[PDB]
Write an enzyme that holds these catalytic residues in place. Structure first.
Site, PDB file in Angstrom:
ATOM      1  N   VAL B  40     126.276  83.222  99.564  1.00  0.00           N
ATOM      2  CA  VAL B  40     126.970  82.319  98.646  1.00  0.00           C
ATOM      3  C   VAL B  40     127.840  83.086  97.654  1.00  0.00           C
ATOM      4  CG1 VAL B  40     125.168  80.560  98.850  1.00  0.00           C
ATOM      5  CG2 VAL B  40     125.056  82.272  97.028  1.00  0.00           C
ATOM      6  N   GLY B  41     127.725  84.413  97.598  1.00  0.00           N
ATOM      7  CA  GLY B  41     128.614  85.219  96.770  1.00  0.00           C
ATOM      8  C   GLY B  41     128.629  86.697  97.089  1.00  0.00           C
ATOM      9  N   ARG B  42     129.620  87.431  96.569  1.00  0.00           N
ATOM     10  CA  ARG B  42     129.629  88.888  96.629  1.00  0.00           C
ATOM     11  C   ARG B  42     130.234  89.430  95.332  1.00  0.00           C
ATOM     12  NH1 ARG B  42     131.780  90.428 100.721  1.00  0.00           N
ATOM     13  NH2 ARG B  42     133.558  89.637 101.969  1.00  0.00           N
ATOM     14  N   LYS B  44     130.884  93.482  92.810  1.00  0.00           N
ATOM     15  CA  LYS B  44     130.914  94.934  92.945  1.00  0.00           C
ATOM     16  C   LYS B  44     129.513  95.504  93.184  1.00  0.00           C
ATOM     17  CE  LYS B  44     133.063  95.961  88.848  1.00  0.00           C
ATOM     18  NZ  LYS B  44     133.103  94.500  88.562  1.00  0.00           N
ATOM     19  N   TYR B  45     128.464  94.841  92.708  1.00  0.00           N
ATOM     20  CA  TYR B  45     127.128  95.429  92.696  1.00  0.00           C
ATOM     21  C   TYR B  45     126.145  94.823  93.673  1.00  0.00           C
ATOM     22  CZ  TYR B  45     129.097  97.294  88.531  1.00  0.00           C
ATOM     23  OH  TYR B  45     129.926  97.975  87.668  1.00  0.00           O
ATOM     24  N   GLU B  47     125.486  91.561  97.061  1.00  0.00           N
ATOM     25  CA  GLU B  47     125.821  90.329  97.778  1.00  0.00           C
ATOM     26  C   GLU B  47     124.720  89.300  97.535  1.00  0.00           C
ATOM     27  OE1 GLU B  47     126.948  91.398 101.811  1.00  0.00           O
ATOM     28  OE2 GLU B  47     129.012  91.446 101.040  1.00  0.00           O
ATOM     29  N   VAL B  48     125.071  88.026  97.393  1.00  0.00           N
ATOM     30  CA  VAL B  48     124.090  87.004  97.029  1.00  0.00           C
ATOM     31  C   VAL B  48     123.906  85.954  98.120  1.00  0.00           C
ATOM     32  CG1 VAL B  48     123.399  85.258  95.351  1.00  0.00           C
ATOM     33  CG2 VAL B  48     124.746  87.229  94.594  1.00  0.00           C
ATOM     34  N   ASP B 151     127.195  89.699  79.088  1.00  0.00           N
ATOM     35  CA  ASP B 151     128.133  89.210  80.116  1.00  0.00           C
ATOM     36  C   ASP B 151     128.148  87.690  80.165  1.00  0.00           C
ATOM     37  OD1 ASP B 151     130.084  89.492  82.159  1.00  0.00           O
ATOM     38  OD2 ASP B 151     128.639  89.928  83.731  1.00  0.00           O
TER      39      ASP B 151
END
Ligand SMILES: CN1CCn2c1nc1c(Br)c(Br)c(Br)c(Br)c12
Ligand SMILES: CN1CCn2c1nc1c(Br)c(Br)c(Br)c(Br)c12
Ligand SMILES: [Cl-]
Ligand SMILES: [Cl-]
Ligand SMILES: [Cl-]
Ligand SMILES: [Cl-]
Ligand code: NA
Ligand code: NA
Lengths: 326, 326
Positions: B40-42, B44-45, B47-48, B151
């Site tokens: 569902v995401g990527r 810099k640190y 992948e999700v 953040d």
């Protein structure tokens, strides 16, 4: 059409019986249950005595009222009943009267008080944070209950310094807040009167009590009591003006479309703001902190709508240790 | 020597083990308990992925981390553990890794989120008050626990709009607050970076998160996202300057004895403040209220020390109905 920024609909949502104090029927108690032991004060509206509850041998305070209209005393009684048990509110214990003359008396819980003129010089920096935090609990409570005190001043704040206990007393000038209602501006005592009262802005709200609080607070941290010392109601506005500056006053009068009586306008004149730090001196240097000043600054605003609410005031970093101590 | 105005001694008073994340020994879980279902995401640190807990058939979120130094991942893990169970904080469920390559994964409770670019245009005036109130609960909580998120941005605020549930996620940039410590200023994401970060003021505190919150909030009420849109870190300060005005910037730089790099100073130039009302337009008119503006105004202050704390923010009259609803 000014309105409160918080708690505006409290009496709207309550049953009418909550705020319709004229519809109250007093349940007179027994005058004999309470004996006067010693007089401890007098005022335009009453004499005050330390007394005893004969039944349980408990001390109490007995306020013998001078002749008062039915409508006025029911308002005071209803508000005391409405707030009874709330954080740091004086507890009304009973209501009684003399059979021959019908003179009514109000019976309250006792507080071992020390007059502020003797007590406040001994308060430390931490003590002031603590007791003002306790007084804010009472103000946030009565505002949340739809009531304005309209006479905040040290004389009406009882403190037992040994027990570190505080009560907000003398609800005789208090009223229910109703959006848009026009109130009498002859309330509070002169040195604690907000600019709204002094310029005849009648649709004021809970925020009047925050001006008065700020007056009391400024007196404590600067050891200058009263902080704003006017001789009459015109002069009261002038002394404020000479501190906050007239630029802020003009903005305020324009926002609420108020016109000063010509006489007052002449007395007020034109003045620059005197920064809070200029009130610091060797007599108060141990109490004047940047956090104390920031909190005061946010109370003493011409525009009632700009002032901290009691709820907001309690979260100010000035009180952070009092909260941590919890 | 700047210090936080609140919660400054939290890590002072806790046991060292609370904040000494380098002394943690990770208790690796079982990599097989969790199966990847969909990406569902990527970033810099990492992948999700949406995943499942095979044992209980519950959805979860699985973050597969790219190669990361031991010290950095222990800091994130410790802070997640410290805050687990707190109001609206994402819950870390497990920590595992691949045996062959040692790649670690972080396992979190699932949230049925809608990306802010799709969700925020459908929020009503009341909805924004409600969700920002929910995000403040998380910030007041982690600050009270001695931690700065560093953040805050919509991308890191998960919202299930059907359930009206919010979680503050991605604690990878977070740190423990210690009085006087000098932090790295390369944190937050550019559009949410506070002036302290952009002028290299390193001894910042929890108040950085309130700047970032104010950036997010301004984006929502004005429907201008990001609100401050700089191309690089110099340009970020310039876009802020062009709104808040350079008079307030100069006061700020002087207070903290900061000197701008000559290049930056040239880019910043000289600018008058643009009043909040000038951002109102037919696209946001349904959301821009005087109370919303007053609350924003008190978040977006150059001087981090002047900003509302999370605790104070929650009591602002803007949220009064959310509180009443309770
Ligand atoms: C002027 N004096 C001194 C002490 N004290 C005074 N008036 C009081 C009133 Br009215 C109440 Br109600 C309470 Br409780 C106290 Br204790 C009072
Ligand atoms: C980019 N996407 C969309 C949904 N979603 C994303 N990243 C997430 C992370 Br990290 C967490 Br932790 C959770 Br909980 C959710 Br839900 C997440
Ligand atoms: Cl009296
Ligand atoms: Cl202090
Ligand atoms: Cl990432
Ligand atoms: Cl509103
Ligand atoms: Na009384
Ligand atoms: Na996360």
């Amino acid at each position: 059409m000014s309105k409160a920024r918080v708690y505006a609909d409290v009496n709207v949502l309550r049953p009418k019986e909550y705020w319709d104090y004229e519809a109250l029927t007093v349940q007179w108690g027994e005058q004999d249950d309470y004996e006067v032991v010693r007089k401890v004060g007098r005022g335009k509206y009453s004499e005050v005595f330390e007394g005893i509850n004969v039944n349980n041998n408990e001390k109490c305070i007995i306020k013998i009222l001078k002749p008062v209209k039915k409508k006025k005393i029911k308002r005071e009684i209803k508000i005391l009943q409405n707030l009874c048990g709330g954080p740091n509110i004086v507890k009304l214990l009973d209501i009684v009267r003399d059979q021959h003359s019908k003179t009514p008396s109000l019976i309250f819980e006792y507080v071992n008080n020390t007059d502020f003129k003797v007590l406040y010089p001994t308060l430390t920096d931490y003590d002031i944070r603590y007791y003002i935090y306790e007084l804010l609990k009472a103000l946030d409570y009565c505002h949340s209950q739809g009531i304005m005190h309209r006479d905040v001043k040290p004389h009406n704040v009882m403190i037992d310094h040994e027990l570190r206990k505080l009560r907000l007393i003398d609800w005789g000038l208090a009223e229910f807040y109703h959006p848009g209602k026009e109130y009498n501006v002859r309330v509070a005592s002169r040195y604690f009167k907000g600019p709204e009262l002094l310029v005849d802005l009648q649709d004021y709200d809970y925020s009047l009590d925050m001006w008065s609080l700020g007056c009391m607070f400024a007196g404590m941290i600067f050891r200058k009591e009263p902080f704003f010392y006017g001789h009459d109601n015109h002069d009261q506005l002038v002394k404020i003006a000479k501190v906050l500056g007239t630029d802020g006053l003009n903005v305020y009068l324009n926002k609420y479309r108020i016109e000063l009586d010509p006489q007052l306008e002449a007395l007020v004149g034109r003045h620059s703001r005197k920064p809070w730090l200029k009130f610091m001196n060797a007599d108060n240097q141990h109490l004047v902190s940047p956090e104390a000043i920031d909190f005061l600054d946010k109370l003493l605003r011409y525009d009632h709508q700009e002032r901290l609410t009691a709820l907001e005031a309690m979260t100010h970093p000035y009180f952070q240790q009092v909260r941590a101590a919890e």
